[PDB]
Amino acid sequence: KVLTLEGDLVLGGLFPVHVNEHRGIQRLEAMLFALDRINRDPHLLPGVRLGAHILDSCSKDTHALEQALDFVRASLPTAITGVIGGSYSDVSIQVANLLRLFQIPQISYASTSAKLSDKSRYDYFARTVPPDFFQAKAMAEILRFFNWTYVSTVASEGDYGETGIEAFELEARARNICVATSEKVGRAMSRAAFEGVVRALLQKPSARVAVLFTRSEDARELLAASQRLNASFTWVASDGWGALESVVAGSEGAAEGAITIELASYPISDFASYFQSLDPWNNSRNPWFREFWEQRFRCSFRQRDCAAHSLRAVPFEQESKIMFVVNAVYAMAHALHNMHRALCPNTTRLCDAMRPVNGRRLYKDFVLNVKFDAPFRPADTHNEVRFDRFGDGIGRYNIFTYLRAGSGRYRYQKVGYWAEGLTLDTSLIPWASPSAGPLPASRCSEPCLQNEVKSVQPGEVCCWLCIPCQPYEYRLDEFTCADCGLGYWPNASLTGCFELPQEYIRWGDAWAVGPVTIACLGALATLFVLGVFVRHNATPVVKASGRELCYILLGGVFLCYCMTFIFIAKPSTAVCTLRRLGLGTAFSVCYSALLTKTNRIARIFISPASQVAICLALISGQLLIVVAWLVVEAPGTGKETAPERREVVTLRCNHRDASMLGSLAYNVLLIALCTLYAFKTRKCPENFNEAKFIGFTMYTTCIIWLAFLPIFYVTSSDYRVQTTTMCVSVSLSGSVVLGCLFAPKLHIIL
Amino acid sequence: RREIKIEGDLVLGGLFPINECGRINEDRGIQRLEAMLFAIDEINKDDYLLPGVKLGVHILDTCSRDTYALEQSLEFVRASLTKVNIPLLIAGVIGGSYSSVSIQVANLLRLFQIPQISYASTSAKLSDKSRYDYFARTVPPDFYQAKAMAEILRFFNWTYVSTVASEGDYGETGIEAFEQEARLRNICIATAEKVGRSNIRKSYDSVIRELLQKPNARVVVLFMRSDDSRELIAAASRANASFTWVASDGWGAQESIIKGSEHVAYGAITLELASQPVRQFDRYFQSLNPYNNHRNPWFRDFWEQKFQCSLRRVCDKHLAIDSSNYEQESKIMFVVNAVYAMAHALHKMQRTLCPNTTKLCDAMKILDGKKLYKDYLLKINFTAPFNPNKDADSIVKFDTFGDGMGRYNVFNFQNVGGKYSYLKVGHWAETLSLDVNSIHWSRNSVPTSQCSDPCAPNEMKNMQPGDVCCWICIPCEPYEYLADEFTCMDCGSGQWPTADLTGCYDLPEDYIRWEDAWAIGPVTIACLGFMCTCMVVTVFIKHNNTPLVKASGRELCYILLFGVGLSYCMTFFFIAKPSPVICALRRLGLGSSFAICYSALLTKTNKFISPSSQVFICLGLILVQIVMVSVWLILEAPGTRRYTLAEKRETVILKCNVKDSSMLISLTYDVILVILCTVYAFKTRKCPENFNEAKFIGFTMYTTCIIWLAFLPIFYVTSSDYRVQTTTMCISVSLSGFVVLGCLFAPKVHIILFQP
Numbered sequence A: 001k002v003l004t005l006e007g008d009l010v011l012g013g014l015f016p017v018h019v020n021e022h023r024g025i026q027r028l029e030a031m032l033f034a035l036d037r038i039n040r041d042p043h044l045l046p047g048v049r050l051g052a053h054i055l056d057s058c059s060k061d062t063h064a065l066e067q068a069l070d071f072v073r074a075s076l077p078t079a080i081t082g083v084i085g086g087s088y089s090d091v092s093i094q095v096a097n098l099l100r101l102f103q104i105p106q107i108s109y110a111s112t113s114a115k116l117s118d119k120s121r122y123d124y125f126a127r128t129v130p131p132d133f134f135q136a137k138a139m140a141e142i143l144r145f146f147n148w149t150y151v152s153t154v155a156s157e158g159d160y161g162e163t164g165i166e167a168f169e170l171e172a173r174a175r176n177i178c179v180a181t182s183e184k185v186g187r188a189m190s191r192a193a194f195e196g197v198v199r200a201l202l203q204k205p206s207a208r209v210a211v212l213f214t215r216s217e218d219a220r221e222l223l224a225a226s227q228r229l230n231a232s233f234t235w236v237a238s239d240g241w242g243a244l245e246s247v248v249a250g251s252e253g254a255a256e257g258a259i260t261i262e263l264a265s266y267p268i269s270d271f272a273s274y275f276q277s278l279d280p281w282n283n284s285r286n287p288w289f290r291e292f293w294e295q296r297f298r299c300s301f302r303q304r305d306c307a308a309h310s311l312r313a314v315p316f317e318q319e320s321k322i323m324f325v326v327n328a329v330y331a332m333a334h335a336l337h338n339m340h341r342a343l344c345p346n347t348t349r350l351c352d353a354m355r356p357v358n359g360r361r362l363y364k365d366f367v368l369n370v371k372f373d374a375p376f377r378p379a380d381t382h383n384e385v386r387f388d389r390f391g392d393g394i395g396r397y398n399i400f401t402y403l404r405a406g407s408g409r410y411r412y413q414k415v416g417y418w419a420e421g422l423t424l425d426t427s428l429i430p431w432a433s434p435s436a437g438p439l440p441a442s443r444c445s446e447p448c449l450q451n452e453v454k455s456v457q458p459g460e461v462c463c464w465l466c467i468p469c470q471p472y473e474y475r476l477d478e479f480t481c482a483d484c485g486l487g488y489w490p491n492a493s494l495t496g497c498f499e500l501p502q503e504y505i506r507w508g509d510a511w512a513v514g515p516v517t518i519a520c521l522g523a524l525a526t527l528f529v530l531g532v533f534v535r536h537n538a539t540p541v542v543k544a545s546g547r548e549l550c551y552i553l554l555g556g557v558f559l560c561y562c563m564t565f566i567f568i569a570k571p572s573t574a575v576c577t578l579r580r581l582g583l584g585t586a587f588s589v590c591y592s593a594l595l596t597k598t599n600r601i602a603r604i605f606i607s608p609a610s611q612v613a614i615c616l617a618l619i620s621g622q623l624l625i626v627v628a629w630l631v632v633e634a635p636g637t638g639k640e641t642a643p644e645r646r647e648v649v650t651l652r653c654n655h656r657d658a659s660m661l662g663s664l665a666y667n668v669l670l671i672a673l674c675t676l677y678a679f680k681t682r683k684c685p686e687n688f689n690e691a692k693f694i695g696f697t698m699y700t701t702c703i704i705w706l707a708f709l710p711i712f713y714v715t716s717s718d719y720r721v722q723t724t725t726m727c728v729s730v731s732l733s734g735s736v737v738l739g740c741l742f743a744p745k746l747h748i749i750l
Numbered sequence B: 001r002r003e004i005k006i007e008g009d010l011v012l013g014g015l016f017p018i019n020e021c022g023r024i025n026e027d028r029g030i031q032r033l034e035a036m037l038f039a040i041d042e043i044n045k046d047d048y049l050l051p052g053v054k055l056g057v058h059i060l061d062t063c064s065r066d067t068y069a070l071e072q073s074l075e076f077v078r079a080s081l082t083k084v085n086i087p088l089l090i091a092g093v094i095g096g097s098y099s100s101v102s103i104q105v106a107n108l109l110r111l112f113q114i115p116q117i118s119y120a121s122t123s124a125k126l127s128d129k130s131r132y133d134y135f136a137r138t139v140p141p142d143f144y145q146a147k148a149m150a151e152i153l154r155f156f157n158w159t160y161v162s163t164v165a166s167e168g169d170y171g172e173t174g175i176e177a178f179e180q181e182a183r184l185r186n187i188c189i190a191t192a193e194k195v196g197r198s199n200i201r202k203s204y205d206s207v208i209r210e211l212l213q214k215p216n217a218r219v220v221v222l223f224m225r226s227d228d229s230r231e232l233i234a235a236a237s238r239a240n241a242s243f244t245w246v247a248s249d250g251w252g253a254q255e256s257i258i259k260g261s262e263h264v265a266y267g268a269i270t271l272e273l274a275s276q277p278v279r280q281f282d283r284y285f286q287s288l289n290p291y292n293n294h295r296n297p298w299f300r301d302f303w304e305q306k307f308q309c310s311l312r313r314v315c316d317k318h319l320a321i322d323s324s325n326y327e328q329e330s331k332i333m334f335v336v337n338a339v340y341a342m343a344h345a346l347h348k349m350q351r352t353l354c355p356n357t358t359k360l361c362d363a364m365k366i367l368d369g370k371k372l373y374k375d376y377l378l379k380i381n382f383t384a385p386f387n388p389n390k391d392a393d394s395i396v397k398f399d400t401f402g403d404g405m406g407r408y409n410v411f412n413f414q415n416v417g418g419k420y421s422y423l424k425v426g427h428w429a430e431t432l433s434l435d436v437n438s439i440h441w442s443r444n445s446v447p448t449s450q451c452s453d454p455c456a457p458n459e460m461k462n463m464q465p466g467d468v469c470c471w472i473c474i475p476c477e478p479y480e481y482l483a484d485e486f487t488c489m490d491c492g493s494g495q496w497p498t499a500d501l502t503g504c505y506d507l508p509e510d511y512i513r514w515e516d517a518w519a520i521g522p523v524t525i526a527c528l529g530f531m532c533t534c535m536v537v538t539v540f541i542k543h544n545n546t547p548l549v550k551a552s553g554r555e556l557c558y559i560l561l562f563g564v565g566l567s568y569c570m571t572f573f574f575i576a577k578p579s580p581v582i583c584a585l586r587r588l589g590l591g592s593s594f595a596i597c598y599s600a601l602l603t604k605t606n607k608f609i610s611p612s613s614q615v616f617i618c619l620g621l622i623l624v625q626i627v628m629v630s631v632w633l634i635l636e637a638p639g640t641r642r643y644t645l646a647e648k649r650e651t652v653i654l655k656c657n658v659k660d661s662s663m664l665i666s667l668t669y670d671v672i673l674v675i676l677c678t679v680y681a682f683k684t685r686k687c688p689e690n691f692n693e694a695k696f697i698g699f700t701m702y703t704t705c706i707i708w709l710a711f712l713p714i715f716y717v718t719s720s721d722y723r724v725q726t727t728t729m730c731i732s733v734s735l736s737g738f739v740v741l742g743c744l745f746a747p748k749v750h751i752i753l754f755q756p
Ligand SMILES: CC(C)CCC[C@@H](C)[C@H]1CC[C@H]2[C@@H]3CC=C4C[C@@H](O)CC[C@]4(C)[C@H]3CC[C@]12C
Pocket: A609, A612, A616, A620, B554, B555, B558
């Protein structure tokens, strides 16, 4: 029947008394004891005394509706400020649906279902016990802190398992945890199917940890199947296998080191003394205590055979949830006290403003924002009771790592707690420091030195290959081999793509020390020797070859000699342009110098004033071709001068590389004129030492032509030592002709 | 507590808003209440629908309040407990008219498995079969109406509108649905008011004042319940509002909301569900009197309120409800269909389950909610009870979630002939079918959206002022580009805006272009200068023909001819295209030619081999100085040919763009050496053999100093503005190359003297 306690603000209860002993009677007496203690306790409602209105639920939805209709039929009995209940998920859901319309808030103590966490459907519902999906955050935290990333998730067919697994999957994204595989465990589908499903979980040897959001029987039978298969695993299990020796039973299996999340509790000492003192005579308030006494002790009050039995003999143990009921009733009491201290300040008694329930403001404002201290504390200074914005409580979970080293088997040892912070005692875990790792589940292809990296993720998100590009292909973003500098390995900068301007200019001797020194030595000697004839300027003119030929010869030797030395220079934008201008003019004037002398001999077989005019006209024509070609060619620095797989070694002018073939063509016309001039000479008697030099020059042009072919093939792609040596040979041959031209002067003067 | 307690074998409850709660509704409460009673008696007096059992009712009142509805709804679930005014078992109830009333009752009845169907609760919050599982409807939900309003606004080209709503669950629910529909049709709401049901002075005046303070929006949408529409219309008359209201099914075609304040609701568009009036119900209501209607406790108040008298003191008690002062409510067919829903569903459930007898079998003592509703109500198909049509509209069918179908009408307040009455204007089956016959407020449909008007691409400055979703157009972009809606970016200084205005393309610069206007002027002198070179060549052609020994110009005259020969050629380069090769040669050509010619004259004025070497050395010294500065200037030739004269992008032009002042500075020391050697001559007092030539040199150099001292200021004042001002610079350079030919004519006339 209805339990009524005299008071002012009567409170409601919905415990499942029907007679159930360890779930119905215990919590009813718990809230009665808490209310009795707080009625006489100061600092909370000194004047007004709370009441009680306890109605059984019978663990049925229809019975729950019928009983809870009494809580809304009043003030639609004294106006009830709130009801306490929610032992079963369906009963709590139904009562929350009924009570939301009448603006009567409730606080729950055992409704851990995740379906009630939405405020869109249950706006005026709150609970003290944490819901079943807060364990997911602790799961990811402990998995990440222990370097475990490859997980084999195991679910359940029930709503609890599905909600837990979906919460874990959603929250693991921020924890960088990927699900290797997801499976389902039905309500005992088949004994033989469990072997198949555990094989489906263990198909991957890389993964070693497995989340176990399953009930007690499912976890026990899965562990039995694993022991039958004789597999080794570490299971970060859930409250279903929470510090229970019945689940493991006698099958040890691979349960060693299995992390278990278990709900905490307070060893209330004051309630034990009160509960041990109940008798069916003094405690006449309870209408179901007589039935409980009759059922528990197997006697009838009518036969007068119940006085001998008493609760003083049987030991008393709380069902890990008496703390939650006391917390809920004291949260309601503190909310009422906050009402009194904020709505009736003038009078210490119940003012006229508190006559209405005011449930809408009460629950929204001063129920979700309560921070009362822990009651009946065992001096563990935990407290931290605070309903969140989602109308749900928070609590701590005692981690119970399985161990068997001390008692042989079935020894649950506490390691740490999860209360707004992860705390694991590694020194207590059996996997101590002297071990080959704490059974590392690890990840897939995760450990890489960052020197080689591909990061393509062929399979799972955690899996990513780290294979380097063969030329290292200027890797910048560590994902795709970029092309910032080129297709080969750059200087790589600070681990990224780069473009090294490194190149060889051949300045410090290298393999062309000979030609570098030969060209400079020959140029100085030729210039000094040429000035000997100019000192007199009267002796040579009487033997023909006047100043017109002497000036051309002096200019020609100077231009070609200096053209060899200018080759050793930095190939800037100016150097490439003058590279064509180097041999485009020096080779032109020297060829035209001998052509004019040869033409004069042929024409005599004169015009001394116009003798130089024809020589420069041919030189200007060669310059006209040079200027018309360089504008089209537009010489510039060429970055690409190395093979595909080698680094940047040379920065030779790319435009001049194509112009090199045209440079020979430009010199071909000068060579053709020289050959034509030599033929016009025909007989060369008396003082004709230049004819022998002309024949040597013809061989020199042939030698240059012979050396021109490797320039296109190999002599340009090499270190340019051969290319620089060719300039010295051309200059030396021109100086050899000069040595065979001013050979009379070498001997006549001496 | 006043209620109807008609008993029977099976009881069907009901919830109607009789009280609007001292007052009594005349058209929404009483009219719908009598429809249910009219349908109930027809079911009893029927042979082809549920025979042998009579149906009772348990109709209550709601006072248009959701909280009061819950208290009355608790009477329905009283008989479903059986644990301890005898209660009667109820198979199902009829939902309240208001959406807020239906939501509260549906949530309560869902737990006890009592089916409920409404007749006017058009709300989009319901029809979600996860919370209000036991709730079907005959009317379409509140999301087709949002589309209908959006289509109507788009049809009349109405963009800037204002919306209001009630604090009840019917108000804000449909506003959100209307938001996407407005956004899809490129229209926006000015403001979204949320006015409550508290009073008029506190909130209603403020809502009207906010709309009145901005007369820009002349058309607004009224998505509010009928309860709140009465006081707002009255409040509009006090504030003298002149808006064109667009109402939902709340206002509908009611003729009682606008009573005494009809002068403000002129031309108001109202949306009402289509429903063919039933002729049978007309006879029942028109022959209804308090002397034969003792079944309705609220009828006495309705009679005392509609016909003003007391049962004006005592009335004649002979007048009856006639067509002169009575109109059919639009949502009456829905109420009749709602009653017949259970009547047909229970017939399909009673006879089929117990074919043995057509009575209450033993299996029907305890009713079921899951099987009765889900299977039978969701598939019941039956033709309209009292209607002369047999089309798809006559038959009533529940959808997957339980609904009707979109048949919204478009009414209009269309006063004509001195009588105030609504008149149909269109239909919204699935397409717009409005006909242009509505009599608007003043003389035509009111125009709106004056905050934003269609502008032109010329401005492209669609900036947003402090208000929202109405941009005003202002001209911007003085030959810029607009690549965004509200920004006018400045393009490149050397480019011109494109026709599409999305970019700023490079305009084609104008060079000298050879044959042209006065810019081609120096070309004529350049052509004349070429003739001077030919004349100089002619002088050279006559020079080699036995040159005079006393002239002593074996090679100095040739150098002078060479100097002046390229001087005319240098003019061609300056008037040619600004090529990188030409730009480099322009500075080198002018400096070398001027220095060489000046050096030759100075050397001649001041054996013969040494002066030739000295002339080449000094010219070479200037030449190597030119290339010394060239490497710091010509190195920008790849970067040359760049646009210049960037004065607000006023037709920018391309030129060398490098060594602008450097070229002027280069010519400074080129002529400084020339003038220094000119004054060093001291008239060259020497033998008369070359004194006449020296006098010619002393005259040409003196004129050269004067023109050079005058040409340089001309270069400075003509800087920039190419092809208009650089033409003068080009003309001066061509003139500079022309005058030195005249200076070279002094040796020519001396050679002419030798000729004859
Ligand atoms: C094509 C052009 C640009 C080449 C450079 C200029 C040439 C044509 C000029 C520069 C200096 C000139 C020389 C200067 C002096 C003399 C001495 C005289 O007794 C005969 C002519 C002669 C030998 C000239 C010939 C032409 C010459 C070589």
